[PDB]
Write a protein that binds this ligand. Structure first.
Ligand SMILES: CC/C=C\C[C@H]1C(=O)CC[C@@H]1CC(=O)O
Ligand SMILES: O=C(O)CCC(=O)C(=O)O
Ligand SMILES: [Fe+3]
Length: 338
């Protein structure tokens, strides 16, 4: 219900001209900090691409899609509307301050540990589905178009997710609607988190967002179209992702890794910052209905591939990152049954 300490808005620090980086934002030396990602042309519906998509989801846990049915002007309007929101004076969003029991609104940290290291970012969080959680009053207000751009952007990415779910299912040799079934059909969950990474006086000591995999089903990520910062990890190597114009990055989430009995892997990512420019990225979360007990699909279980995770609802699961904040992939790996 409350934070262990008052919230410092990272924008307030960058708007000062601090000579140093506060120790709360200095990461251990062990964890202190752009390559092309092959793109998938989506208006192609059993191609070589189906092998590539499945190859990406199994070894990397992410892929980049172009020609996906979302308007490029809508993609940019979503970014610039949110960028305008974060360019507002800090005290203009303070009334939207979020709290740890729903996290909805204007936030600057994730987790409730009092001494915990912090990330160099502010963010906004809101729900889109289910409808009893959707509330325009908990949305921003200043950019007069922002709520209409959020609603349509959310509508378009819900549609895109349903189509992506069909490719993910088929690539596992399942009925093309098996994932949509496991998530709860049409009453799935959809939320949005927009991340603001202001300039950082010593970015080689800081992280815009510490390592983690997304707890939910899949993430549709719209990274900043101008500034690099997103990094994915492949076998202890942190690789900076060069964004492709008006493409999305599709992230396998923790919930799909569990459903695929670890055939699909959830990507581990982090954000680096820099001293000279900011970043704005949009994270759309497509999640299973939160009271459905999630477990490895029975279709993928043999006696030599037994189910690797016990059942757990997404309501129970999401509290791990809500209480601890980013902890890499230790949340899902501590979920592997003994
Ligand atoms: C680092 C971004 C990952 C997850 C975003 C998290 C928030 O920002 C608050 C809630 C959300 C997780 C949830 O769906 O419970
Ligand atoms: O800033 C980015 O490009 C990625 C944001 C991110 O990692 C997330 O919140 O899912
Ligand atoms: Fe993320």
């Amino acid at each position: 219900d409350e934070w262990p300490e008052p919230i410092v808005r990272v924008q307030s620090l960058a708007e000062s001209n601090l000579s140093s980086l506060p120790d709360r934002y200095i990461k251990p030396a062990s964890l202190r900090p752009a390559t092309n990602i092959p793109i998938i042309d989506l208006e192609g519906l059993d191609d070589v691409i189906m092998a590539r998509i499945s190859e990406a989801c199994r070894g990397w846990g992410f892929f980049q899609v172009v020609n996906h049915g979302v308007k490029p002007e809508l993609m940019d309007a979503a970014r610039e509307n949110w960028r305008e929101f974060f360019h507002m004076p800090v005290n203009a969003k303070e009334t939207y301050s979020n709290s740890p029991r729903t996290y909805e609104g204007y936030g600057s940290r994730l987790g409730v540990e009092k001494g915990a290291s912090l990330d160099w970012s502010d963010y906004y969080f809101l729900h889109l589905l289910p409808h009893h959680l959707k509330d325009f009053n908990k949305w921003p207000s200043f950019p007069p178009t922002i709520r209409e751009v959020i609603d349509e952007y959310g509508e378009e990415l819900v549609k895109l997710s349903g189509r992506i779910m069909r490719v993910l299912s088929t690539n596992l040799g399942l009925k093309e609607d098996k994932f949509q079934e496991a998530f709860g059909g049409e009453n799935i969950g959809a939320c949005l988190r927009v991340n603001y990474y202001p300039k950082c006086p010593r970015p080689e000591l800081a992280l815009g967002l510490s390592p983690h995999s997304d707890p939910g089903g899949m993430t549709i990520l719209l990274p900043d179209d101008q500034v690099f910062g997103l990094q994915v990890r492949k076998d202890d190597t942190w690789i900076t992702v060069k964004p492709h114009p008006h493409a999305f990055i599709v992230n396998i989430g923790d919930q799909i890794q569990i459903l695929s009995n670890s055939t699909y892997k959830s990507v581990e990512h982090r954000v680096i910052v820099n001293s000279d420019k900011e970043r704005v990225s949009l994270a759309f979360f497509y999640n299973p209905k939160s009271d459905i007990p999630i477990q490895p699909l029975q279709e993928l279980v043999s006696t030599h591939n037994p189910p690797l995770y016990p059942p757990m609802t997404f309501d129970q699961y999401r509290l791990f990152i809500r209480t601890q904040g980013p902890q890499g992939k230790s949340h899902v790996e501590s979920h592997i049954s003994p």
